[PDB]
Ligand binder design. Structure first.
Ligand code: GSU
Length: 529
RNA sequence: GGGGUAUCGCCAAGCGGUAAGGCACCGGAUUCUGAUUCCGGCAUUCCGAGGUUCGAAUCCUCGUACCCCAGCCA
């Protein structure tokens, strides 16, 4: 429960409403991030919890910043998260004609006029946060001139920035938004939905209140930066002929430590090629997390946990991670994989090999079991063998022994180093019938694998607050390793996650895995204390 | 100037009866994953200072900190 849901309960009870109708209205000017997920869960979640409706509307009022690839990727993300919208997908562009007609109604009521102040003068005439603005010398044109001048704008008779439509309100309002807000501006750009039919586009504030109203929206839910906008929102609907007046509510926007959360900054990371793309596994985008291995249910869980309030906040990576660990720990089948391999021979072993059974899930037999190949030449992680080490070290130590996961107990005996003195192969002996603990892979049956370990994109908690956030990127946000996995992973499918015992949760695709050389992304490491 | 928010490290309930929960953390028990699971601990105070009240984090007052607004962006 959150304040907004309680308001809804109140509205329902009092009969003010009989159905709830929300909307998710992103601008297709980039991909969606975990923040947008919070909005998606909120808006669609309320819809299904109350048997209401949630529309998917592309707020496409600015052609030069938008692209068809973005709308495509957005429908994709919303669908992947697990939500369905009301009827067809909607586009603000579907209302250009309506918007144009409503602009004409305002002009007719003397509430709007064509201003010819340059883009620099409008700022000069706007006043400041502490000084009132001043009326434009064109503010009192007659209905007829405005009507004529507006038509010229629509017809392309004005070069960009030479004219625009403004609402006639109050140049001396403490709300800078009421200082004669621009309704329409000229843009000779092609629109991904309307082609070149328009050379004038409606602004956000004008478009949104009308789109919500025509769509029958009952609760327009957005973020805190739009609180000031509410006054203009109500002003517009109050002055045009439209039957419904949706109520607005603002919640705080999500912030995650060690990353940025604005399409503008994320896009910069894409354009300057510092990440592979919007869906790079290190990105806080929804598609990036998906490729990283997060489940749509783990994201819905996270959104549910962080809550919806009016307080500024920055969640910790640990929280998001706990969500993904909870899911995978329960559903991900276990497998063996060695990231930093070192040859280990069991001089004691006779033959070409045998087969040992391993649980597909240690704490869940119902998830079945599988046959895994064991032999005399195996790979173990270079970090699980110490010639000495303290008393805490519970792994392989020269002279001492360790249990091979779901297999035999081996005793390190003789080690062998190379030129620079690095160990090349560890010699051990195994007990006839013996079935800490370390994982392993039979060298002979091992599947060569590329393992991509990921880490926080940035070095600091709040990279957004840095002068040059790019200069604070973590050089080790991605580190690639070549290792060995049990033959079993030969069937691994993209997106599907596995737990590589004693390491973490991994998944395929990564956009790079082939048939010859598979690529696994570390979604997240195991809780290691 | 206007609009907002201040409750345990990070989130977050609480709407006058006198501090939920999650994440994190600290112990202990399990365990062929130093994982998981499982017990136990963790704000005598709710930005601060007065005030109304039998009693407030929840009502009032004066403060203080932080966030958003001066795109023909959204
Ligand atoms: N970090 C964050 N945390 C949580 N919610 C966030 C968010 N960033 C954006 N949002 C919300 O996502 C929705 C779409 O984002 S967006 O594509 O930028 N488009 C817009 O903001 C505007 N076209 C919508 C205006 C409105 O809804 O009043 C918008 O509704 C916006 O409020």
């Amino acid at each position: 429960t959150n304040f907004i849901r309680q308001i809804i309960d109140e509205d329902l009870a009092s009969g003010k409403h009989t159905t709830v109708h929300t909307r998710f209205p992103p601008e297709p000017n980039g991909y969606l991030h975990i923040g947008h997920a919070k909005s998606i869960c909120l808006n669609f979640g309320i819809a299904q919890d109350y048997k209401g409706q949630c529309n998917l509307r592309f707020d496409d009022t600015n052609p030069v910043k938008e692209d068809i690839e973005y709308v495509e990727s957005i429908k994709n993300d919303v669908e992947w998260l697990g939500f369905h919208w009301s009827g067809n997908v909607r586009y603000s562009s579907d209302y250009f004609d309506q918007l144009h007609a409503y602009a004409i109604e305002l002009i007719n009521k003397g509430l709007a006029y064509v201003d010819e102040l340059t883009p620099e003068q409008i700022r000069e005439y706007r006043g400041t946060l502490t000084q009132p603005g001043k009326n434009s010398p064109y503010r009192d044109r007659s209905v007829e001139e405005n009507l004529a001048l507006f038509e010229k704008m629509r017809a392309g008779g004005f070069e960009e920035g030479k004219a625009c439509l403004r609402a006639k309100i109050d140049m001396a309002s403490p709300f800078i938004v009421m200082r004669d807000p621009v309704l329409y501006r000229i843009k000779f750009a092609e629109h991904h939905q309307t082609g070149n039919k328009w050379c004038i586009y409606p602004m956000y504030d004008f478009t949104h209140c009308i789109s919500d109203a025509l769509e029958g929206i009952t609760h327009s839910l957005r973020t805190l930066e739009f609180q000031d906008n509410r006054r203009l929102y109500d002003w517009v609907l109050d002055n045009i002929t439209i039957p419904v007046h949706p109520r607005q509510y603002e919640f705080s926007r999500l912030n995650l430590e060690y990353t940025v959360m604005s399409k503008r900054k994320l896009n910069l990371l894409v354009t300057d090629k510092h990440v592979e793309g919007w869906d790079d596994p290190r990105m806080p985008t929804i598609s990036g997390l998906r490729r990283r291995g997060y489940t749509a249910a783990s994201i819905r869980e996270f959104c549910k946990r962080i809550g919806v309030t009016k307080q500024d906040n920055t969640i910790e990576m640990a929280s998001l991670e706990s969500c993904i660990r909870e899911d995978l720990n329960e559903n991900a089948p276990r497998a063996m994989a060695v990231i930093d391999p070192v040859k280990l021979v069991i001089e004691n072993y006779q033959g070409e090999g045998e087969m040992v059974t391993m649980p597909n899930h240690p704490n869940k037999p119902e998830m079945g079991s599988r046959q895994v190949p064991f032999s005399g030449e195996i790979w173990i992680d270079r970090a699980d063998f110490r010639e000495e080490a303290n008393k805490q070290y519970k792994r392989l130590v020269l002279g001492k022994e360790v249990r091979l996961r779901n297999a035999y107990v081996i005793k390190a005996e003789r080690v062998e180093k190379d030129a620079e003195g690095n160990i090349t192969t560890i010699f051990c002996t195994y007990d006839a019938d013996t079935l800490g603990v370390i994982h392993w892979v039979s060298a002979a049956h091992a599947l060569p694998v590329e393992i991509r370990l990921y880490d926080r994109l940035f070095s600091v908690p709040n990279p957004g607050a840095a002068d040059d956030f790019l200069s604070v990127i973590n050089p080790e946000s991605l580190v690639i390793k070549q290792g060995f996995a049990e033959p079993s992973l030969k069937d691994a499918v993209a997106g599907k996650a596995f737990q590589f015992e004693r390491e973490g949760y991994f998944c395929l695709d990564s956009r790079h895995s082939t048939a010859e050389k598979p690529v696994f992304n570390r979604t997240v490491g195991l809780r290691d204390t």
